[PDB]
């Protein structure tokens, strides 16, 4: 009837292991093989149980909160479509992981920023930086056909929040297979990874082609506070002061100037043009992404 895929309890920029998913899926309808290493490390291989129509619902992960910008996370995106799949099919499922929140901090100094005691980043704005949230990873559903990875659905991740919110955005969709799977713009704050983007820095979210790990936080923020929030598995960009971009088929832009108020933008979702759209993309995911598959009659 129904098959539910999760991050297998994994968080942060690295994907899950076989052990984690075996533990997660015990007693459920789901069996997967988790990629052990290299390009598809942490991707879940699922055997399609016979030909038929499958309604696939993919949910990207939310972005992280900022240290002084925490009213809400940018929600990850839900996309869905009906796929007529044949006998012997296998689906590859990368479940996006939430962008890291700036708070609680991963160091004493970054935790003091979280309590509102430190205003050092603002006061200096050897560059002082920190407080942003990482970009959420996108959720990817794909297959191998004719010797190639073929994307079926990509559900965008949410951009991470900037350090600060001001004293006082449609979901993006790609539906052309020939469209470039490029990465988000960025800088110290990392843009999101796409399908095929090349990461210009350790902070950029990696593309699926690069293994999709989240970007690390910027080194200037580590130099300032001893810690920085990372992007989530599935191409989320690392934080700086500005927030990291969300992963996607195309990654979300991050600030190119580490602007104190610049939230990362969300990724771009993808629906393969052979499929039947079910519901339009909608940002609803609060935390990690997921995939839910059901038979469609």
């Amino acid at each position: 009837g129904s098959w539910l895929f999760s991050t297998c309890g994994a968080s942060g920029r690295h994907g899950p292991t076989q052990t984690q998913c075996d533990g997660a899926y015990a007693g459920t309808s789901v069996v997967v093989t988790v990629g052990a290493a290299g390009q598809l490390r942490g991707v879940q291989l699922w055997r399609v149980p016979g030909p038929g129509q499958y309604l696939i619902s993919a949910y990207g992960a939310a972005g992280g909160k900022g240290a002084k910008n925490h009213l809400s996370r940018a929600h990850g995106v839900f996309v869905s479509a009906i796929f007529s799949l044949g006998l012997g099919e296998s689906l590859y499922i990368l479940v996006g992981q939430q962008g890291e929140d700036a708070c609680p901090g991963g160091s004493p100094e970054s935790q003091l920023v979280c309590l509102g005691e430190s205003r050092a980043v603002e006061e200096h704005a050897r560059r002082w930086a920190g407080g942003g949230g990482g970009g959420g990873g996108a959720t990817y559903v794909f297959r191998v056909r004719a010797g190639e990875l073929e994307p079926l659905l990509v559900a965008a991740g949410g951009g991470g929040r900037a350090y600060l919110r001001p004293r006082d955005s449609p979901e993006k969709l790609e539906n052309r297979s020939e469209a470039p799977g490029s990465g988000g713009r960025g800088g110290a704050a990392g843009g999101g990874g796409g399908w095929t983007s090349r990461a210009p820095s350790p902070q950029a979210g990696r593309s699926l082609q690069e293994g999709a790990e989240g970007g690390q936080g910027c080194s200037e923020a580590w130099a300032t506070l001893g810690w920085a929030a990372a992007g989530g598995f599935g191409g989320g960009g690392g934080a700086c002061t500005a927030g990291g971009g969300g992963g996607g088929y195309r990654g979300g832009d991050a600030s190119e100037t580490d602007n104190l108020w610049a939230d990362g933008e969300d990724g771009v979702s993808f629906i393969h043009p052979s499929s039947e759209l079910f519901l339009q993309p909608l940002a609803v995911t609060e935390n990690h992404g997921e995939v839910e598959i059901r038979r469609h009659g």
């Epitope: 093989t33 598809l40 296998s90 010797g147 190639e148 990875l149 799977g181 095929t196 082609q209």
Partner: nanobody, 120 residues
Framework: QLQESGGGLVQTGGSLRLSCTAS????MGWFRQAPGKEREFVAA????????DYSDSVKGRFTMSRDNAKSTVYLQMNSLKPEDTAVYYC???????????????????WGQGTQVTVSS
């Protein structure tokens, strides 16, 4: 950037050696696309370990090899059959897990290939 060579026109039972030279770069592979059919896996090999894999169709007839120094891989094709007629393509390859399908690791990036034709 790949460059494939070695194709030609042979008779059933014939033999050819394909070459592919790469630039940059764990595994390389050969795929082939026949008229009116999808591209399909033929063979793979690891640069470091020399471990190989083959489609059921070519086992016992084709041998993949490589020259690390020359960044070149080879497909030795013997006992050729009409159904081996195709354009043959080289790629850097990966696979998710033992037994899963091989695929081109540089998504969508292909050389011009080399034509192999086997007459009856």
């Amino acid at each position: 950037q790949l460059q494939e060579s070695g194709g030609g026109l042979v008779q059933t039972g014939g033999s050819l050696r394909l070459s592919c030279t790469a630039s940059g770069r764990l595994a390389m592979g050969w795929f082939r696309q026949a008229p009116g059919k999808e591209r399909e896996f033929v063979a793979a090999i690891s640069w470091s370990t020399g471990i190989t894999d083959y489609s059921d169709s070519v086992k016992g007839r084709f041998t993949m090899s490589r020259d690390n120094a020359k960044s070149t891989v080879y497909l030795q094709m013997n006992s050729l059959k009409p159904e081996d007629t195709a354009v043959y393509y080289c790629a850097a390859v990966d696979r998710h897990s033992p037994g899963s399908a091989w695929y081109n690791r540089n998504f969508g990036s292909w050389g011009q290939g080399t034509q192999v034709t086997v007459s009856s």
